[PDB]
């Protein structure tokens, strides 16, 4: 017999499932592939060994485990065609690997956004779609989800393969019986002006993996998550949503937060000065206003506390994403914690509630900067502040604190039985040099005046003259390199705001779902018409008349 | 941005201070602004409880405005 | 010349050790000036903590830039 | 600072190299695991009939052109 | 500090019979786009006296490219 011989395959766990057809495809040998398929080789054989998985800690090459995906992933179009439409055994274009990935999922996987890789991966994606429609008009490959529930578009969005996404979202196919696979259509074109229509299926809303939701709620490890929202339909859609729906709601929330902080400010400012809270309410107008302000302040704290919980549960950040991103959410949550601890101490009859309350109050005002997103100038400014705090201020503060503590310990050792003679006071006196208030003769309680003055001059040169001016130089370097990155992060922050606004929505309004339900093709594989909620974009071009 | 930070920390500090000389938004705002021109006293009052909280607030203000924001302003004017 | 134009860190650690040893000698020679040496060791010791910022990508670059600033711009400016 | 970015990267790498060398020379435990990369047979055909084992270092690379 | 010649030598590969053994870079397997090179490491990691890493790292500061030579592929990957 031949059926057992031709289909023999490796049994070891490292190369498990690899057979002769895989080898022939790998070696780019068309004749051997043809011969093996002719002799009854199984075109569905899954090479699922450890070598054929992602497995970043070991060598390997994941391609989707199937001969069709192997041919596709290696830029062999002829073999793809042959495998799909040979006489003896056509391949199952919709087959799935152990991960649930199809050929198209694999093509997304191998993409890495380089020009030469991206060009052919996009081309192979296109050709596979054409052949799928011609072989199986009733099949919808792009709607098949892997074991993680991701469609190829969702996988491209989450993995950050900007090239493939940029191809898919404006894919247009100009021929009969493949028009319906298009996502970008041209409705009319009068002079140089022409009105394109983008599909917006699974961009605006879907079951789970809307493209906007996938990009915005990325795990911060996606490579190009800042750059992907520059892909044409997405940016124009976000701007439209902002202007039509969300600009007013965001401004309203900003106004409300302003009022809340004014109330909190007034309530804290006029606190009573007797000891031992809680304080008996007096039957007078001013005290009624005061207690009203206190109640509203605590209520707002509770609101932000529960909002922070809802954010944590919805995003489930994995204990690094909880901190390396979602800066603003953590800060708002910490404000709410300080408010709540203030309440608890207030009723537990401790004056230390004041210590918590002010930390809330100060923090509350600084979180006003959260609302500088949604302004092109100020949002960029606030983003740059955040990046400064995270990079340059942290590095500087480590080095500065090493120098400060070193010279502080030296000076306090040299000082003997004086007023300062302690790490705390000496640290304050040395820090005062940084703010331009160093006495430079703050004590005489020593021997060896020369040693003391040498130490202080060394400190002053190293921190005041060297380090601070170096910090200014470094921040100057930084802003020169984070202008455009700041623009992209601002756009991303506004996108997140838009998504959260649509999710909250507070009025059960369906006007959030924009762009109108238009007829694109009117000719699906069956006789029905397709309405696909297109988004209209008008363009003008002075070439290609 | 500076006025947001200034008013936030002024309101915090003036809340923490109790029945002292300053004890007002005007005097405290002036006293915190004095840090920007390199004249911050850093011990301008003792009329409080919780010295540690007061010092933490002032050092936070100083870092955020004097060290971070002014140097950032110089960087941005350089870019502009 | 190579003893000074490079091996910056090695010189600094050696000088810390010299200050410690002079501190010991003065301490047992019944001179109070040992304190003067000890603090110079102590201060210097803490600053030599920056030696270990190599082996961290973003911090080691920062420490190297400090060294280059000290050698070029701070020296010319101080003259 | 605008001119010593890349130079700083190279000097950082060199300083880490110095650290690595000094560490392997001190080593404090008489451990031979410091000598890495495994003794592989490269060619197996020297000018004589003997095989050559040359302690190679393995580096994997991917290229999407030149198929 | 002759970075050019060094960069040539360390990844020298000769594709013909009876000169394979002179190579220092070899290709073991290449499956798809993925391929596994082997660099010799004789006289680089360790040797009698003049290991390449020791020679570069302990340069006299007057070698022109002492910073740049460790960017050559096998050396940087080995150090990492
Ligand atoms: C990064 C963390 C979460 C942080 C949380 C609190 C404690 C915070 O202290 C810091 C540590 C610190 C302390 C003092 C100076 C700088 C940094 O910085 C921030 C954090 C530091 C900030 C920096 O200012 C901002 O971040 C405002 C802001 C900017 C951009 C935003 O997108 C934003 O979203 C809400 C908020 C302000 C403080 O909350 C503040 O006003 C007080 C009293 C302390 C600051 O910890
Ligand atoms: C360059 C020489 C060897 C030097 C040796 C001593 C005396 C030193 O004074 C200097 C002269 C000086 C004095 C005051 C301010 C700047 C410079 O600078 C360094 C040297 C200057 C330094 C500068 O800070 C550093 O070098 C820390 C450091 C950074 C990077 C490194 O790779 C490093 O390797 C250990 C150390 C700190 C001092 O040792 C210090 O803390 C005291 C008390 C004096 C500084 O002489």
Could you walk me through the main structural features you see in this protein, from its secondary elements to its overall organization?
Chain B: It is found in: Postsynaptic cell membrane; Cell projection, Dendritic spine membrane; Cell membrane. Chain B: It comes from Rattus norvegicus (Rat). Chain B: Na(+) 1 binds at residue 38. The structure is cut from a larger assembly and holds five copies of chain A. The first copy, chain A, is mostly helical. The first copy, chain A, has a domain at 1-233: Ankyrin repeat-containing domain (Serine Threonine Protein Phosphatase 5, Tetratricopeptide repeat, Alpha Horseshoe), CATH 1.25.40.20. Helices cover 55% and strands 3% of the residues of chain A. The first copy, chain A, contains 19 helices and three strands. A three-stranded antiparallel beta sheet of chain A has the order 1-2-3, covered by helices on one side. The radius of gyration of chain A is 32 Å and the shape is globular. Chains in contact: A-B, A-C, A-D, A-E, C-D, C-E, D-E. Chain A binds chain B through residues 265, 268-269, 271, 273, 351-352, 354-355, 357-359, 361-366, 368-369, 372, 378, 381-382, 384-385, 388-389, 393, 396-397, 428, 431-432, 434-437, 468, 471-472, 475-476, 478-480, 483, and chain B through 1, 4-5, 7-9, 11-16, 18-19, 25, 35, 38-42, 49-50, 53, 57, 59-60, 62-64, 66-69, 71-72, 74-76, 78-79. Strand 1 (57-62) of chain D pairs antiparallel with strand 2 (34-39) of chain E. The complex binds resiniferatoxin (6EU) (2 copies).
């Amino acid at each position: 017999s031949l059926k057992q011989f031709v289909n023999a395959s490796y049994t070891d766990s490292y190369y498990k499932g690899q057979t002769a057809l895989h080898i022939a495809i790998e070696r780019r040998n068309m004749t051997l592939v043809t011969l093996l398929v002719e002799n009854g080789a199984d075109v569905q054989a899954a090479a699922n060994g450890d070598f054929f998985k992602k497995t970043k800690g070991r060598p390997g090459f994941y391609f989707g485990e199937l001969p069709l995906s192997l041919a596709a992933c290696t830029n062999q179009l002829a073999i793809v065609k042959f495998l799909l439409q040979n006489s003896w055994q056509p391949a199952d274009i919709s087959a799935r690997d152990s991960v649930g990935n199809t050929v198209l999922h694999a093509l997304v996987e191998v993409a890495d956004n380089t020009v030469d890789n991206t060009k052919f991966v996009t081309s192979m994606y296109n050709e596979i779609l054409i052949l799928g429609a011609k072989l199986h008009p009733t099949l919808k490959l792009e709607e098949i989800t892997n074991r993680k529930g991701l469609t190829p578009l969702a996988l491209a969005a989450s993995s950050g393969k900007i090239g493939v996404l940029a191809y898919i979202l404006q894919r247009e196919i100009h021929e009969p019986e493949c028009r319906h696979l298009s996502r970008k259509f041209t409705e009319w074109a009068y002079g140089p002006v022409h009105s394109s229509l983008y599909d917006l299926s699974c961009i605006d809303t879907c079951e789970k993996n809307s493209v906007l939701e996938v990009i915005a709620y990325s795990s911060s490890e996606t490579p190009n998550r800042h750059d992907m929202l520059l892909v044409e339909p997405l940016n124009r859609l976000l701007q439209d949503k902002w202007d039509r729906f969300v600009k007013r709601i965001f401004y309203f929330n900003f106004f409300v937060y302003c009022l809340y902080m004014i109330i909190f400010t007034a309530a804290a400012y006029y606190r009573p000065v007797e000891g031992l809270p809680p304080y008996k309410l007096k039957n007078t107008v001013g005290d009624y206003f005061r207690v009203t302000g206190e109640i509203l302040s605590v209520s707002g704290g509770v609101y932000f506390f529960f909002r922070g919980i809802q954010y944590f549960l919805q995003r489930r950040p994995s204990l690094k994403s909880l901190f390396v991103d979602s800066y603003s959410e953590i800060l708002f949550f910490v404000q709410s914690l300080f408010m709540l601890v203030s309440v608890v101490l207030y009723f537990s009859q401790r004056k230390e509630y004041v210590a918590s309350m002010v930390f809330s109050l100060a923090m509350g005002w600084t979180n006003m900067l959260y609302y500088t997103r949604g302004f092109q100038q100020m949002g960029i400014y606030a983003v740059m502040i955040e990046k400064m705090i995270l990079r340059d201020l942290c590095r500087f503060m480590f080095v500065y604190l090493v120098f400060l503590f070193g010279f502080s310990t030296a000076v306090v050792t040299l000082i003997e039985d004086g007023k300062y003679n302690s790490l705390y006071s000496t640290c304050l006196e040395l820090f005062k040099f940084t703010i331009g208030m160093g006495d430079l003769e703050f004590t005489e309680n020593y021997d060896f005046k020369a040693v003391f003055i040498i130490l202080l001059l060394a400190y002053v040169i190293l921190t005041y003259i060297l380090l601070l001016n170096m910090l200014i130089a470094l921040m100057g370097e930084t802003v020169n390199k984070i202008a455009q990155e700041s623009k992209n992060i601002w756009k991303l922050q506004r996108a997140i705001t838009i998504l959260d606004t649509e999710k909250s929505f507070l009025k059960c309004m369906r006007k959030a779902f924009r762009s109108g339900k238009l007829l694109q093709v009117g000719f699906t594989p069956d006789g029905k018409d397709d309405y696909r909620w297109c988004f209209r974009v008008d363009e003008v071009n002075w070439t290609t008349w």
